[PDB]
Amino acid sequence: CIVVDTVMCPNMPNKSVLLYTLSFIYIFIFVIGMIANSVVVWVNIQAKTTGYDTHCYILNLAIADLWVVLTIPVWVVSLVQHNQWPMGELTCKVTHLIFSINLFGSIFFLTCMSVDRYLSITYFTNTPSSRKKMVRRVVCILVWLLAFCVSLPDTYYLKTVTSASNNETYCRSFYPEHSIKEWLIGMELVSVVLGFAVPFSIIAVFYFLLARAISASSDQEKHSSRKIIFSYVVVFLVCWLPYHVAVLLDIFSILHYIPFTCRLEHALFTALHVTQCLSLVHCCVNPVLYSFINRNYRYELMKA
């Protein structure tokens, strides 16, 4: 006593407009991000001869953002063809590894920056420069290793296929056949718990503490301002939140809590791509927020 119900989704309609516009915006982001990050690294390396004390996190964060931007053109090529993957097998694995490592590096370094900034006005205030330099170097190496460990798995299982029916190539992920669901949820939930939730929580708490401390001290209040402090948290949220709501909605679709319908597939596809665009805008808004504003940096920019 059962029933059979047939539902045929119409062939995917025209998608030239969306793909073309997203590629257009990606080119702008690539140019305006690569240029800014290169200048910041150059100034940071050059400043050390003027007696300044540049911060290692800024240099490492700049490198991480630069690496992420370099690989946008690969996605642009792979996107104009509606997710096809003409490139070879090694390209897919290598490109994903680079992107994942250098995108988690930036997210972790933001949290490390927040903690270091609070401690540098509360705790490190009477520590010799050598000790703080050593501590920062150790943390830099540790963060790189942690990002590499998190990113390795997804790259291991990646592989290409050619659809038997449609006969076009694709690059997907193949998991053990006895734990397919567990791996998918796990590897799309690690990017949401170790990518947004924990880093954002730490950043919010520690910048709030820094704001309270700076307000309590009259002398610091006159020079520094509390607009930039809250600007840091708001920029991170606005950039990343939409993407990690689309992904969290994609997971719900996998589990079939959301009933399926012809519209859901198209809506989720458009939402994921459009939101990933902003997720990368974060990679160019970073130098404009951390280095281009500091008065000392600008004075060093013109002189170099």
């Epitope: 300044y52 911060h55 009259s218 520094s224 500091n294």
Partner: antibody, heavy 125, light 106 residues
Framework: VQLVESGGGLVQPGGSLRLSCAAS????????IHWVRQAPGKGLEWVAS????????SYADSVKGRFTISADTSKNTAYLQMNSLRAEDTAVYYC????????????????????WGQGTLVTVS | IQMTQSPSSLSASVGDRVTITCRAS??????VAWYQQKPGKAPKLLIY???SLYSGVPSRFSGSRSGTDFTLTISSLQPEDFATYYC?????????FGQGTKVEIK
């Protein structure tokens, strides 16, 4: 910004004394306080330092483990406990500050002792 | 961390050029400062960091760095600039000052 020292006075060898460095015009927890001394007609030499907030404290090798330094952030003041004085420790003590500026976090220069005080004379017979 | 300052005495006349040198033992990455002390008075900072110049003091004083050989140069001497100078390093605790350089009217 204004720092004033208080204390001093001749004390017999083997005694002890308190030296108080009071600060005004700024919260003390955002700037380390250092203590330096000058013997009669001699060059300066660092002695001690403290950060009021988390109570970090370093010291000088020649007097390691013989002094105490405690900073009260409530009253924006620093206390140096002198004990087991020798006859050769007579000098003039200044308390200085090492300003830390927050508006330049990522790009800062290695700061130096900005504001000093008149200091007080410590003598030993 | 011994910090050797040379020369220990000068006799520059008014309006001449003065040069003082401070040499470190280990390597300190541009974390030196230069202080001036009048006879029987509180020292006041002249140059903080290797080369920057403290906001408020005249522009005659110029600080330069080369390897581990820090140098202080005064282009012109005025009657109000005849005192003692010290060099300090703020890298390796404990902080060690210089021996002290004295300038006297010729």
């Amino acid at each position: 910004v204004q720092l004033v020292e208080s204390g001093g006075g001749l004390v017999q060898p083997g005694g002890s004394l308190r030296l108080s460095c009071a600060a005004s015009g700024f919260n003390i927890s955002s700037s380390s306080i250092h203590w330096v001394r000058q013997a009669p007609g001699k060059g300066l030499e660092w002695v001690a330092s403290i950060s009021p907030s988390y109570g970090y404290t370093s010291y000088a090798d020649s007097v390691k483990g013989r002094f105490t330094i405690s900073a009260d952030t409530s009253k924006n003041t620093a206390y140096l406990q002198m004990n087991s004085l020798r006859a050769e420790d007579t000098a003039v003590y200044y308390c200085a500050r090492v300003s830390y500026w927050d508006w330049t976090w990522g790009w800062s220069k290695y700061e130096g002792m900005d504001y000093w005080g008149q200091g007080t004379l410590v003598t030993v017979s | 961390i011994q910090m050797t300052q040379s020369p220990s005495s000068l006799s520059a006349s008014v309006g001449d050029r003065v040069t003082i040198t401070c040499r470190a033992s280990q390597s300190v990455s541009s974390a030196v400062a230069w202080y001036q002390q009048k006879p029987g008075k509180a020292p006041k900072l002249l140059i903080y960091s290797a080369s920057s110049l403290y906001s408020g003091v005249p522009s005659r004083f110029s600080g330069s760095r080369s390897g581990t050989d820090f140098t202080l140069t005064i282009s012109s001497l005025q009657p109000e600039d005849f005192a003692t100078y010290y060099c300090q390093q703020s890298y390796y605790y404990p902080i060690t000052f210089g021996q002290g350089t004295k300038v006297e009217i010729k």
